[PDB]
Point group: D2
Chain length 330, copies 4
C-alpha cells in the first residue's frame, strides 16, 4: 500500500480515537484557561506564554500557504485570509508538532509496520487530530453534540469551525464511557474519488468501495451547499443513515483553480433517530430504504436499472431475443 492508505489504516485500527492525544489536548485546553470563542487569539497567547512562539498574521505568504513556522527565530506566520477557526486550527497543529512531539512519536511507534514516509504522514495526521481535539474539547463537544441532536451547522456556529471540521470530530467520539454515535466520515469529489475515510468501527466504505451512483454522497454536488440525506440499504441487508453536503470554499479568483469536495457522515439506521436530520423521515419502514451497493463490479443486486458494470461474481446470460431496461440483467 501507499503512505496515505497506511495512515488511513493506522487510524482505522484505533477506532479513529487516540485516547492519549485526545486527553492531552483537553487537559491543555483546561489548564491553559481556554474558553470556547475566539480561540485564535487565546492560542496565540498560549504559544507565546508556554512555548516562546510569536504568532503573527501575515498577508505576505504565498497564496497557497496557510502557515509557516520559522524554528530558528520561533515565529509562526498564519495566513490573513483564514477565518478565526482556521487560524486556530493552524496554530494548534503547530502546537502539537512542537509541544506534543514525544507523545506523537510514541503513538506512531505503536505501529512498527509503517513505512518510512508513512510515519511522517502519520505525524501530520496526529497533529491534525490534536488540533481537532483542542478546538473541540472532548467532553464539551460531545456534550453539545448530544444537546444539539448532532446539527453540524449549529455545532460549527457554537465552536466557530466549518462543516468538515465538525464532521471530523464527530467521527472521533469513541472515548470509553462517553461515546457518541459511531460514524463513518468520507470526503469525495465530483468524479467519485474518496480522499478521506474515517470510521468509529467497521463499515462497508471504511477502507475500499463507494462507487455506487445511488449513494447520496455523490448526489451532494447535484444540490450544492444543501444537506442531503438518505436511508440506504446495502446488499447484505444492513441499513444506514447518510447525510452529506458540499464544502466549496475558495476566493482564489474567478479564473483560479477551485477546490470542491463533499463530506458525508453515515451511521447505522438504529442511531438515526438521535439526529436532527431524521426529522420528517420515516425510519421504521424497510420498504422506503434506497437499495445501494459498494460499486457495480462488487454488487450482486440482480435488478438494478442504474448498473454500470457486470457483477464480477458469476455471469449473466446474453440474449439476442430480448431487450431490457436492466443492464447486465439476464
Amino acid at each position: 500500500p501507499m503512505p496515505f492508505e497506511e495512515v488511513r489504516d493506522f487510524f482505522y485500527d484505533r477506532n479513529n480515537y487516540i485516547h492519549d492525544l485526545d486527553m492531552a489536548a483537553e487537559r491543555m485546553f483546561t489548564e491553559s484557561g481556554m474558553r470556547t470563542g475566539g480561540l485564535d487569539i487565546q492560542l496565540a497567547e498560549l504559544m507565546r506564554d508556554r512555548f516562546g512562539i510569536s504568532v503573527v498574521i501575515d498577508d505576505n505568504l504565498p497564496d497557497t500557504a496557510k502557515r509557516r513556522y520559522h524554528p530558528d527565530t520561533k515565529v509562526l506566520r498564519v495566513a490573513h485570509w483564514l477565518m478565526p477557526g482556521q487560524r486556530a486550527f493552524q496554530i494548534a497543529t503547530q502546537l502539537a508538532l512542537v509541544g506534543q512531539s514525544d507523545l506523537i512519536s510514541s503513538i506512531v511507534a505503536t505501529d512498527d509496520q509503517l513505512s518510512t514516509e508513512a510515519r511522517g504522514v502519520a505525524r501530520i495526521g496526529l497533529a491534525n487530530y490534536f488540533a481537532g481535539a483542542f478546538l473541540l474539547p472532548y467532553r464539551e463537544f460531545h456534550r453539545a453534540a448530544e444537546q444539539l441532536r448532532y446539527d453540524i451547522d449549529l455545532l460549527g456556529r457554537r465552536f466557530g469551525v466549518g462543516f468538515e471540521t465538525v464532521c471530523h470530530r464527530l467521527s472521533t467520539l469513541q472515548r470509553p464511557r462517553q461515546r457518541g454515535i459511531p460514524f463513518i466520515f468520507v470526503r469525495t469529489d465530483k468524479a467519485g474519488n474518496i480522499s478521506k475515510r474515517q470510521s468509529a468501527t467497521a463499515f462497508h466504505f471504511s477502507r475500499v468501495g463507494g462507487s455506487c451512483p445511488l449513494w447520496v454522497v455523490h448526489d451532494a454536488f447535484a444540490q450544492p451547499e444543501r444537506i442531503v440525506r438518505q436511508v440506504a440499504q446495502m446488499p447484505d441487508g444492513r441499513s444506514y443513515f447518510w447525510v452529506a453536503k458540499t464544502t466549496a470554499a475558495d476566493g482564489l479568483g474567478y479564473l483560479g483553480p477551485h477546490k470542491n469536495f463533499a463530506v458525508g457522515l453515515g451511521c447505522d439506521l438504529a442511531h438515526a433517530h438521535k439526529l436532527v436530520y431524521s426529522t420528517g423521515v420515516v425510519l421504521d419502514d424497510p420498504s422506503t430504504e434506497v437499495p445501494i451497493g459498494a460499486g457495480c463490479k462488487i454488487c450482486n443486486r440482480t435488478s438494478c436499472a442504474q448498473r454500470a458494470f457486470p457483477y464480477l461474481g458469476g455471469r449473466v446470460a446474453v440474449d439476442e431475443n430480448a431487450g431490457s431496461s436492466l443492464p447486465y440483467s439476464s
Copy 2:
C-alpha cells in the same frame, strides 16, 4: 480483461466504424424505400414483407422489457412505452440479428482473441451498431450533421432519436472520403463510473482513466438536462473540446429504480470551431483552457488544489512547519 472490455477494444481497434455493416445498413435502408420520419412504422412492414416477422406493440410485456422475439412464431413484441425512435431502434436491432446474422458472424471472426462470451457481447454490440446505422443512414446523417454544425438536439429532432443515440452515431463517422469530426464518446454516472467508451482515434480516455473532477463531464449532474462545455488541456499539453449532458429517461414511478447517465463528446480543440457549442467561446487562447487530468494517481500536475491522491510517480513531501492549500504537493 473482461468481455465488455474486450468488445470496447474490438470497436476501438476498428476506429469505431464497421464499413461492411454500415454500408449494409445504408443499402438496406435505400433499397427498402425507407424515409426518415416514422421509421418505426416502416420497419414493422419491412419486417413483415422481407422476413415474415410480425411486429406487435405489447402493453403486456414485463415492465422492464424493451422487446422479446419469439423465433418459433417469428413474433417481435415491442414495449408500448418506447417512443417511436426507440421502437425503431429495437426493431432494427432484431433486424440485424435475424437478417444480417452471417455478416455479423464474419465481422466477429476478424478478432481471433475474443473470448467465447466476448463474441456474444460483440454480436449484440454489432446489432446495436447496425440499428444506429439504419436509423441514421450514413451519408444523409453526415450531411445533416455538417449542415446543423453538429447540434445534437437538432439532429435528434430531425431524425426522431434521443441525445445518446445521436452522440453514438456521431462517434462512428469514419467512412473514408466522408469523415465527420473524430470524437471520443463516454457515458458516466454520478459516481464517476464510465460505462461506455467509443473512439474514432486515440484519445486519453479511450480505454482507461477519466476520474478527474475538473473534467466537465462529471459536472453534468450539477446542471441536469443542460449542455455543459469545456476547453480542457491534458497534462501533456494537448487540448480538447468537451460537450456533455445528462440523460434521464425514466417514469418508472417515484419509488421505482432510476436511471441517470451523462453522455460526453470530446474532440481536438482544432475542430471545436465547426461545433455550434463553440458559439461565444474564445478558442485561440491557451491561458483560458482548464487544466484537467486522467485521474489523480496518474496525474503529474504540480499545483492542483483539487488533487485527491498523491501522484504515483512523485514522492510525498511532508513539512511540519508549513500548511498549504495544495494537498499532496510536490
Copy 3:
C-alpha cells in the same frame, strides 16, 4: 381584468370541471372504439371516418407550428417532431373545435360577462379541456390514478402523455360521485411568474399570490427534472402538500430559444397520505411543516429570515441600536 385572467376565473368558477364537455369526450372515446395506446393513429382514423378530415404528418410546417388545419380542403397537418401523445392532443383539440363547436359555444354562453376576446380564449381553453378529457377518459384515468396512488410519471407512461398533461387532468377530477383528490395546479418560470392556475376548489394561490421563496415550487429549478415535495403551512394555519417538477422540452438547438417551466400540484395535507409522494414523510407532526406565505408584502409572519419586503399591514419599528438577521422585524 385581461382575457387570460377572465378565462382562468371562468374555469375557477366551475371548479375546474366541465361536466357536459368531459362526458362528451368520454362518450366519443367509447362510441368510437378508442383504446388507450397509440391514440394518435386512432384519432387520425376517427377524423377521417367521422369528419372527413385528412390528418397528415408534416415536416414542412414552420419550426414553431404544432399543427395547422386547412378548412377549405379539410386537411389537418401535425408537426413531425411531436411525440405520439402530443400529436393526439393536437388532433383532439382540432376535433373539439370542428366536432364540438356548438357545445363549446353554449358553455361559453353560460358566462355573459366575458369580454369579446375572452370568449375566443375560452373557446381555446375548452378545446384543450376536451383534448385532455379525450386522451384521458374520465373513469379510466380516475381509476388508474387511484390504483397508482397518483404517481404522475406512471400515469403518463400508461396513457402516453407528459407530466404537465397528467397534472392538468388530475386537477379536473371533480365529477360528482367520482371525485379525485381536490388539487391546485400551477405553472411557474425561473422568475416566479405563475402562468397557469387551476383549482378544484378555493386555495390560497387559486387566483393571486404565490411569490414566497420558501414555497417548494420555486425550488424545482434548483433541482431540475426531479420531483420536489414539501409539507407547507400557510400563515392562517392551513397545511398543504406540494409536489413540483420542471418540464424542459426543447430540441430547438443549442443557440435557439428555450422554454423552461415548473409544474406544481398541491392539496390539503389531509389527502397527502393517498399520494405516493408522501412515502417516507411524516405527516402527523405539525412541527415539521415548513412555514411559507403568499408573498412578503401580504405575509404577516413576524420572524421570517427570508423576508424580502415589509408586510403591508401595520409597520415595524426602526432601531438604530440593533442589528438583526430578520429583515423588517422590529
Copy 4:
C-alpha cells in the same frame, strides 16, 4: 410609494454615491491610522479611544441579534458568530450612527419629500453606506478593483468581506475623477422578489421590472454558489453584461429558518472587457447575445417561447386552426 422604495429612490437620485459621507469615512479611516486586515479589532479600540464605547463580543445575545447598543452604558454588543468583516461592519454602522449623526441628518435633509419613516430608513441606509465606505476605503478599494479586474472574490479576500458587501461597494464608485465601472446592483430570491436595487446611472431595472426568466440572475439558484454570467440584450437594443451568484449565509440549524439570496451586478456591454468574468467570452458579436426583457406584461418581443403573459400593448391573436410553441404570440 412605501418607505423602502423612497430610500431606494433617495440613493438612486444621488447616483448611489454620497460624496460627503464617503469622504468622511475615508478621512476617518486615514486619520485613525487604520489598516486593511483585522479592521474589527482596530474598530473596537477606535470606538473606545474616540467615543468611550466599550465593544463586547457577546455569545449571550439572542440568536438573531447581530448587535445591540446600550447608549446609557455606551456598550456595543456584537454577535460571536459574525466573521471578522461582519463584526467590523456592525461596529462601523454603530460608528456612523453615533459619530456621524449630524452629517447623516444633514444629508437626509436634502430630500424634503421623504416621509417621516423614510427618514429613519434613510438614516440606517446611510449608516450602512458609511460602514461600507469605511471597511472599503474609496481610493484603496478602487485601485484594488482595477488591479484585480473586478474579481469580486479576490476583493473580498483582500479586504476580508463577503460577496454582497463587495458588490455593494462596487456599485458606489462614482466619485468624480475616480470612477469605477457604472453598475446596477440587485438582490433577488428564488421567487423573483428583488429586495435591493442600487444604480450608478439609469438602468432598466433601477426601479421596477426584472421578472424575465431568461435573465441570468434568476438562473443563479440553479447553480448555487457558482458565478453565472450573461450577455443580455434588452428589447430596445441596448446590451449589458451580468454577473450573479447566490449568497447562503446560515448555520441556523437544519430545521431553522433559512436565508437564500442571489446578488447580481450589471453593466454596459462596452465595459465587460475590463471584467475578469469576460475571460473566454466573445463580446463583439450581437448574434450571440441573449434576448431578455423586463417582465412579460411589459415586453414587446414577438417570438418568445418562454413568454408567460401577453404583452399589454399588443392584442391577443387567437387561431382555432393553428397550434404554436409560442404562447401569446403576435
